[PDB]
Amino acid sequence: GFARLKRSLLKTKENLGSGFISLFRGKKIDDDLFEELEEQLLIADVGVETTRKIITNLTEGASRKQLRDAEALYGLLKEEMGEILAKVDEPLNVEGKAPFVILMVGVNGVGKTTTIGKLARQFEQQGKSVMLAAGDTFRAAAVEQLQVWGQRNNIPVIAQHTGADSASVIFDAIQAAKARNIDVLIADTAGRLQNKSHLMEELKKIVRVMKKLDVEAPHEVMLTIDASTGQNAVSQAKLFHEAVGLTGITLTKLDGTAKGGVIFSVADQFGIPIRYIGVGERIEDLRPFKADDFIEALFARED
Ligand SMILES: [K+]
Ligand SMILES: [K+]
């Protein structure tokens, strides 16, 4: 089962999940084994803190249960790592708002820009009217790219001159969305990390301004991070969550990277729902995150 996701995770399965089998084959449970397992988790970008938790719980379980053969650790690991992901399994529900406002935050990159377009296309296929707000106002090339994408797909894009106030662009976009019976408004934001304090004050202003039109907006603050960036995804998540309240995460580029293990660090450290994972280039390859499918694909050795 889950053959498509197994293929997407092929490189990650070399070190995690089914990748544990060859590590445990024929070994005894002792300090040396747990040291090697810890190293393998860290090499897979699970992160120091999440790895320490896994090792602590696995060591105590094996000791209390008086396990002797390392092979038995496979099942315990599947349970422990499966629970990490199940705790952040909650799909995004955009129904019933006028409009439902998604504030897209994260650092500038192919991930965030592509995710906006894929989500917009998916929502349209679901029968919803979509509008985009070009809130990354100082990057003229990014704004035009979004306007061009909107014209190619007949989706309206709200934009102002280069250097306009991002909070004003998004405010005007919400007003236009309400006036035009839009179901979902997706607002892009700046993603420059050179001046951390400036970006976070900018995001806080965007959120405050929205409340004049709808106290419930933004209905979702979605972070986009790239699994191929390893621990940079974790530090980016920490920065954006501490400044603005994240309510969902999209993790892109899980396919073809040996760093897929970072999903466990993101899930464990922040406890924010992972709404979507990107496992391919098609629109539909931005798929709703299902923790059970993911863990089964990761740990199953069959195809
Ligand atoms: K992508
Ligand atoms: K055009």
What is the bridge-based pairing of β-strands 157-158 and 274-278? unpaired
Residues of the chain with CATH 1.20.120.140: 3-87
**Å resolution of this model?**
1.5
Q: Would you say 109 is a known binding-site residue?
A: yes
Distance 132 CA to ligand 2 centre (A): 15
Domain 100-299 part of CATH 3.40.50.920: no
What CATH fold (topology level) applies to the domain 3-87? Four Helix Bundle (Hemerythrin (Met), subunit A) (1.20.120)
Q: Give the burial string for 84-117 (b: 16+ CB within 10 Å, else e).
A: bbeebbeebebeebebbbbbbbbbbbebbbbbbb
Contact 289, 274 (CB under 8 A): yes
Q: Give the burial string for 215-247 (b: 16+ CB within 10 Å, else e).
A: eebbbbbbbbbbbbbbebbbebbebbbebbebb
Distance 143 CA to ligand 1 centre (A): 18
Contact 95, 183 (CB under 8 A): no
Q: In what order do the strands lie in the sheet with 130-133?
A: 157-158, 130-133, 184-187, 100-105, 220-226, 248-252, 274-278, 286-288
Distance 152 CA to ligand 2 centre (A): 6
Q: Would you say 223 is a known binding-site residue?
A: no
Count other C-beta atoms under 10 Å from residue 248's C-beta: 20
Distance 279 CA to ligand 1 centre (A): 8
Distance 26 CA to ligand 2 centre (A): 62
Distance 218 CA to ligand 1 centre (A): 23
Residues of the chain with CATH 3.40.50.300: 100-299
- The experimental method, as deposited, was X-ray
Ligand found nearest the CA of 148: 2
